[PDB]
Design a protein around this ligand. Sequence first.
Ligand code: CL
Ligand code: CL
Ligand code: CL
Length: 180
Amino acid sequence: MKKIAVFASGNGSNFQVIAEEFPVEFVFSDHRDAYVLERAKQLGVLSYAFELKEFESKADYEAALVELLEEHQIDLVCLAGYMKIVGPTLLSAYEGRIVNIHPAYLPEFPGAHGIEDAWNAGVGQSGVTIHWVDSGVDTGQVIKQVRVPRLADDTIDRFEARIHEAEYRLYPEVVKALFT
Ligand SMILES: [Cl-]
Ligand SMILES: [Cl-]
Ligand SMILES: [Cl-]
């Protein structure tokens, strides 16, 4: 059985869902004040945290990540709200072992704010994409994709909530197939 690690930069809502249905070795955050650390404390999940400011370069930053992953014998790294590009240091160690979820029907609206990009565009449907991570930005092999509709009386809050709910149901399903 694979040992799973989770990277979350913010609220860590996806981490909450994963940790409830899958045993998580530990969860990392690039923000020492992220709320995902609070959830880990409540779920009894090990949690590490260090910022980019504490390193000379991004290479040294990702070097600490690799050492941390290798120490816990991590077999799969789930990016659940990790708002940072995966550099070559981390890719060289965990190529084809890193999955990521994206609040957009790739390759439509890639980036950090795929929700706002799709909402400002006026497209009738967005989606949720779970894929592998390579050198490119959101250009990995797609594992699972679903469409998320846009309503008439939809605010940016109502629309964002529909995407996140789609993420909470899709992520455990995809991991369930990859976990074993
Ligand atoms: Cl999240
Ligand atoms: Cl997200
Ligand atoms: Cl993303």
